[PDB]
C-alpha cells in the first residue's frame, strides 16, 4: 500500500478537497495517470487520522466501476493516490454532453453503477450516499462510483424518518441516481422544500417519468421506490434487468 515518493510525479491542480488540493499526476510501478489528494494540516495527528481514514476504507474494494485506491504516502507531506477519472463529475458531463449522449450511453452508465453496487452488496457494505454527484467519468463508455461527501431528496423514507441506512435504502437512492442520469444531471424535486419531500413520498408521489426514458426502465425505478423496504429489489435483479434494457436499446 505504501508508495515511494520518487515513483510519483506531481502535476496540475484539478480541484479542491476537504483537507487540501487535488492534483493530477503519473505513477510508475507500467505508467498510470493518477489523482493526488493532499493535506495541508496533516502535521496534526487528529487531521491525519480523518484524512487517512479514506485510504483505510477504500483498500478493501476492487471493482472495475469503483474508484481505485493506488496507495498512500504516510511520510509528511501525506498524500492519497487515486485512479484518475479524466472526464470528471457525472453531473457536469451529462449537462455539457447532453446532445452528444444517446439513450444507450445513459443506460450503460446506470448498468455499470448497478454492477458496482451489486459488488458492494456482495461484501455486505452499505454506501449511504448514492447520487450522480458521487459518480466520476473515466471515459465516454466508463463511469466509476466514489464518495466525495443531509441529501433528503435522494433518501429512502426510513432514512429520513428513522436514520435507517440499509441495502434497501441504497436501492432507493440508486433509483433516484438512475432518474438523474436519464434527466442529464438535473437534480430531483427542484423548487421543492426538504420538508415538502417527506409528505409527497408518504402520499404515494414519485419523481415523474423522464422524457425519452423507456417505460420498462421507469417501471424499474418505481420498484426501487417501494415504500416498504422489503419489497425493493436487490442489485443482482437491477443489474440483470438493466442489462436486458441495454440490449433492447442497442438492438434499436
Ligand atoms: C472517509 C471516507 C470517504 C470516502 C470513502 N470512499 N468510499 C468509497 C466507496 C468504495 C464506498 C465508493 C470511495 C471513497 N472515496 C473516494 O471515492 N475518493 C476519491 C476522491 C477523489 C477521486 C478523484 C477526483 C478527481 C479525479 N479523479 C479521481 C477519486 C476517489 C471512504 C472513506
- The verdict on 178 and 219 lying in the same domain is yes
The C-alpha atoms of residue 231 and residue 228 are separated, in whole angstroms, by 6
Ligand 1 centroid, distance to 15 Cα (angstroms): 14
- What the block records as the C-alpha cell of 108 is 450503460
What's 69's domain CATH number?
A: 3.30.200.20
Going by alpha carbons, the residue nearest to atom 28 of ligand 1 is: 84
Q: Pick from 124, 88, 137, 145: which is nearest to 234 by CA?
A: 124
Ligand 1 pocket, mutate which of 135, 147, 165, 173 (most atoms under 8 A from CB): 147
Going by alpha carbons, the residue nearest to atom 14 of ligand 1 is: 147
- The verdict on 142 and 232 lying in the same domain is yes
- To one decimal, the resolution in angstroms is 2.4
- The verdict on 118 and 201 lying in the same domain is yes
Does the Cβ of 61 fall within 6 Å of ligand 1? Answer: yes
- What the block records as the C-alpha cell of 177 is 441516481
Annotation says 129 is catalytic? yes
Instruction: Please work out, in degrees rounded to the nearest 5, the angle formed at the alpha carbon of residue 126 by the alpha carbons of 167 and 174.
Output: 60
**Method used experimentally:** X-ray
Boundary residue ending a domain (49, 84, 119): 84
- Do residues 112 and 142 touch, judged by C-beta distance below 8 A? yes
Ligand 1 centroid, distance to 207 Cα (angstroms): 28
Cis status, amide bond into 77, omega within 30 of 0: yes
- The verdict on 200 and 226 lying in the same domain is yes
- The verdict on 119 and 176 lying in the same domain is yes
Domain count, the chain: 2
The C-alpha atoms of residue 43 and residue 161 are separated, in whole angstroms, by 40
The C-alpha atoms of residue 61 and residue 169 are separated, in whole angstroms, by 21
SS3 content of the chain, % helix, strand, coil (to 5): 40, 20, 40
Residues 6+ apart with CB under 8 A from 160: 152, 197, 198, 201
- The verdict on 9 and 130 lying in the same domain is no
The C-alpha atoms of residue 216 and residue 180 are separated, in whole angstroms, by 16
45, 62, 102, 129: which is the annotated catalytic residue?
A: 129
- The verdict on 216 and 130 lying in the same domain is yes
Per the structure, the complete domain to which residue 211 belongs is given by 85-250
Radius of gyration of the chain (CA): 19
- What the block records as the C-alpha cell of 78 is 501525506
- The verdict on 119 and 222 lying in the same domain is yes
User: In angstroms, what CA-CA distances link 168 with 145, 180, 189, 230?
Assistant: 18, 19, 21, 7
Does the Cβ of 69 fall within 6 Å of ligand 1? Answer: no
- The verdict on 31 and 138 lying in the same domain is no
Does the Cβ of 91 fall within 6 Å of ligand 1? Answer: no
- The verdict on 92 and 186 lying in the same domain is yes
Q: Pick from 90, 243, 233: which is nearest to 171 by CA?
A: 233
The C-alpha atoms of residue 145 and residue 119 are separated, in whole angstroms, by 11
Task: Sort strands 79-83 and 32-38 into parallel, antiparallel or unpaired.
Answer: antiparallel
Going by alpha carbons, the residue nearest to atom 31 of ligand 1 is: 54
Amino acid at each position: 500500500y505504501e508508495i515511494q515518493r520518487e515513483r510519483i510525479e506531481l502535476g496540475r491542480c484539478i480541484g479542491e478537497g476537504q483537507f487540501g488540493d487535488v492534483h493530477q499526476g503519473i505513477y510508475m510501478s507500467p505508467a498510470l495517470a493518477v489523482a493526488i489528494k493532499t493535506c495541508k494540516n496533516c502535521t496534526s495527528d487528529s487531521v491525519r487520522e480523518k484524512f487517512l481514514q479514506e485510504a483505510l476504507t477504500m483498500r478493501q474494494f476492487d471493482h472495475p466501476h469503483i474508484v481505485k485506491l493506488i496507495g498512500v504516502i504516510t511520510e509528511n507531506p501525506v498524500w492519497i493516490i487515486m485512479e484518475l477519472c479524466t472526464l470528471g463529475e457525472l453531473r457536469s458531463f451529462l449537462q455539457v454532453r447532453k446532445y452528444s449522449l444517446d439513450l444507450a450511453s445513459l443506460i450503460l452508465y446506470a448498468y455499470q453503477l448497478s454492477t458496482a453496487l451489486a459488488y458492494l452488496e456482495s461484501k455486505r457494505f452499505v454506501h449511504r450516499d448514492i447520487a450522480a454527484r458521487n459518480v466520476l467519468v473515466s471515459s465516454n463508455d466508463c463511469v466509476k462510483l466514489g464518495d466525495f461527501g443531509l441529501p433528503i431528496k435522494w433518501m429512502a423514507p426510513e432514512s429520513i424518518n428513522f436514520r435507517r441506512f440499509t441495502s434497501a435504502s441504497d436501492v432507493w437512492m440508486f433509483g433516484v441516481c438512475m432518474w438523474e442520469i436519464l434527466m442529464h444531471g438535473v437534480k430531483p424535486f427542484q423548487g421543492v422544500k426538504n420538508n415538502d419531500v417527506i409528505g409527497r413520498i408518504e402520499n404515494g408521489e414519485r419523481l415523474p417519468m423522464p422524457p425519452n426514458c423507456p417505460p420498462t426502465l421507469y417501471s424499474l425505478m418505481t420498484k426501487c421506490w417501494a415504500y416498504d423496504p422489503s419489497r425493493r429489489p436487490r442489485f443482482t435483479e437491477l443489474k440483470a434487468q438493466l442489462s436486458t434494457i441495454l440490449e433492447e436499446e442497442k438492438a434499436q
